[PDB]
Write a protein that binds this DNA or RNA. Structure first.
Ligand SMILES: Nc1ncnc2c1ncn2[C@@H]1O[C@H](COP(=O)(O)OP(=O)(O)NP(=O)(O)O)[C@@H](O)[C@H]1O
Ligand SMILES: [Zn+2]
Length: 617
RNA sequence: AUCCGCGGCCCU
RNA sequence: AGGGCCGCGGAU
């Protein structure tokens, strides 16, 4: 099944032709409306004796299972055949059978380079706002439009699907003006070839009483540090390095990176190694502002404890280790004794007293370490009388959670966990949510709306914990203004005259199509260790397996490293990782490449960037 | 146990 | 260009 009255008006144009976008406020239940267009569609095709299909593209693999089980499957189980997919089955073959297909976005893209658009009848799109020139989803929409222009020439026919997009909500990317904001929304319609945004107007009251917004709240605040800065300054005079920017902040952090890069090139030890150590100290200062002082210390302890094993000694590491390990006892002492220290502690407790048990809670924080550090802060410090969730991608030297392990935490939340701490935001379902605090996190107007929509119902409160300065609050205000600005922008395009709207939308389409004219895409090098200048591998000695893993099997290389699997230099600088098949792989980042033609040392972040091709194995 | 490639969003 | 964060795909 059944559609609520407000959801009927938004679905009416989609029901007959008229490819549209559907944007309804968060918590509206708008994935359900998509199911109704599908039923309407397929049933209509059987009567017309024409084929039926639906591709239902999504941004998350976890949404594939979630959408299937909750929305599309249970209603359509008897009538039509539904399949979710992200297990070693051929894609053109699933398309043969199975009236409805819920797939990860890229999975289709892969097969458009076989299966074509012409086969599919209707396309359903989760979070349309990702649609842009830059990314999935998608390039696929430009394939649809490119095919469409082909039809414009024929008239002067190949069948094209109906496109039903679903987003809350398009938003204005990075544009303060009211004029430019509209330009983004015309672009979003242009890429989706949708006729109108089709918001909810006639039934607006029905909704407002059904789904309520959280009241935005505000919390603000305004020894270890001076101890630590003292250490860094002495390290600075050791190398005769003057940054000119204050310690414990980003512009200074970026200067320390750039200094290490150039130091690898000139091959001067003490200049680079210190800078790497400085990056580590600076990290402690910047986290100490936003996180418990024990974590500031722990970040440095584990760093140094790992440096003893890597090493097992030159004058530099001795100056640094001796300097830290004498002060090690001191810092741990300062860490465990209680501005920044007290932050938000009251905030959750106020929510626990009001309602019987604060059954739901959600925190948002910038960094992965902060999620784990806060959770550990909340597990301790009972009586109250909490768990963390983080992403799957691999960077920063933290370990991603398993996708199933994430699925575990939400299912445990549906019950053992009262409060979760995440940077993931949109696309995962939580109900009965109230507090939803954002801790030091800015993001953009679209992430704000998705996150805000977490907590409903009822009486929900949306809180921002901020530093006095540099404030997040100034960036948050502008986000809100833009949230409000998108609505007026979504208004302009609906009441724009059809003759104008269609004429201009084409110029956005032909422009996006004409755009891609571009091209998509060996003994000349010698690799040196970056910490220390020693020949590691000449360029012949590297090999490639399956076009991906860059490996050195040359027995000479075996001599140069130690293990523990992780590969490390004589010096102790990490070199690579040991992958086992029945092959050692090395990260480019740990080496500095010397060009032969004239000696120039360039350093690379990843393998693809360097022009030379390597021999396959 | 990771690798590899691609892409978004932030901030300087 | 950096760092942080998020995600998809192809590997073993
Ligand atoms: N038309 C409907 N009639 C009855 N229940 C509905 C309807 N639509 C959604 N629901 C319920 O709402 C739940 C899912 O919708 P909801 O959690 O509010 O987010 P949603 O479908 O993701 N909307 P959105 O976040 O804006 O994409 C389901 O458990 C349904 O029980
Ligand atoms: Zn070395």
């Amino acid at each position: 099944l059944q559609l609520r009255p407000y959801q009927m008006e938004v679905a009416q144009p989609a029901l007959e032709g008229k490819n549209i976008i559907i944007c309804l406020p968060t918590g509206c239940g708008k994935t359900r409306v998509a199911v109704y267009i599908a039923k309407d569609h397929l049933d209509k095709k059987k009567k017309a004796s024409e084929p039926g299909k639906v591709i239902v593209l999504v941004n998350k693999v976890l949404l594939v299972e979630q959408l299937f089980r909750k929305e599309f499957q249970p209603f359509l189980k008897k009538w039509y055949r539904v399949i979710g997919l992200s297990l070693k089955i051929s894609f053109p073959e699933v398309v043969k059978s199975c009236d409805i297909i819920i797939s990860t976005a890229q999975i289709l893209e892969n097969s458009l380079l076989g299966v074509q658009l012409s086969d599919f009848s209707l396309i359903i799109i989760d979070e349309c706002h990702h649609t842009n020139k830059e990314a999935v989803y998608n390039n696929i929409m430009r394939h649809y439009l490119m095919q469409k222009l082909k039809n414009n020439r024929l008239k002067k026919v190949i069948p094209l699907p109906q496109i039903l997009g679903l987003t809350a909500s398009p938003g204005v990317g990075g544009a303060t003006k009211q004029a430019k904001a509209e330009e983004h929304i015309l672009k979003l319609c242009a890429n989706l070839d949708a006729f109108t945004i089709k918001t909810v107007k006639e039934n607006l009251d029905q909704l407002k009483n059904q789904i309520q917004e959280p009241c935005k709240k505000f919390a603000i605040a305004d020894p270890f540090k001076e101890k630590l800065l003292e250490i860094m300054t002495r390290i600075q005079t050791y190398c005769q390095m003057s940054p000119m920017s204050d310690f414990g902040t980003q512009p200074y952090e970026q200067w320390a990176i750039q200094m290490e890069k150039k130091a690898a090139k000139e091959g001067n030890r003490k200049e680079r190694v210190c800078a790497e150590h400085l990056r580590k100290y600076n990290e402690a200062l910047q986290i100490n502002d936003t996180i418990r002082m024990i974590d500031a210390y722990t970040h440095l302890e584990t760093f140094y404890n790992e440096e003893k094993d890597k090493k097992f000694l030159d004058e530099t590491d001795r100056f640094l280790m001796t300097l830290f390990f004498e002060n090690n006892k001191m810092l741990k002492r300062l860490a465990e004794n209680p501005e920044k220290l007290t932050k938000l502690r009251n905030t959750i407790m106020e929510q626990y007293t009001r309602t019987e048990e604060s059954a739901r809670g959600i925190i948002f924080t910038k960094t992965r370490q902060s999620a784990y550090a806060l959770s550990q802060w909340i597990t301790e410090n009972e009586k109250f009388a909490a768990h963390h969730l983080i992403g799957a991608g691999h960077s920063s030297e933290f370990k991603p959670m398993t996708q199933n392990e994430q699925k575990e935490v939400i299912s445990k939340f549906r019950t053992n966990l009262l409060i979760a701490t995440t940077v993931a935001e949109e696309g995962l379902d939580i109900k009965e949510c109230n507090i939803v605090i954002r801790y030091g996190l800015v993001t953009n107007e679209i992430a704000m709306v998705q996150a805000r929509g977490r907590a409903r119902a009822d009486e929900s409160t949306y809180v921002l914990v901020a530093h006095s300065g540099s404030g997040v609050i100034e960036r948050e205000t502008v986000n809100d203004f833009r949230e409000k600005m998108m609505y007026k922008a979504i208004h302009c395009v609906q009441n724009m005259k059809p003759e104008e709207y269609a004429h201009k939308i084409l110029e956005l389409q032909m422009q996006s199509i004409m755009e891609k004219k571009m091209k998509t895409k060996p003994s000349l090098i010698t690799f040196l260790c970056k910490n220390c200048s020693v020949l590691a591998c000449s360029g012949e000695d590297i090999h490639v397996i399956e076009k991906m893993h860059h490996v050195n099997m040359t027995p000479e290389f075996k001599e140069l490293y130690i293990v523990r699997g992780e590969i490390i230099c004589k010096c102790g600088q990490a070199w690579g990782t040991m992958m086992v098949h029945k092959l050692p792989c090395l990260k480019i980042r740990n080496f500095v490449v010397v060009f032969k033609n004239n000696s120039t040392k360039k350093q690379y972040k990843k393998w693809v960037e360097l022009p030379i091709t390597f021999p396959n194995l």
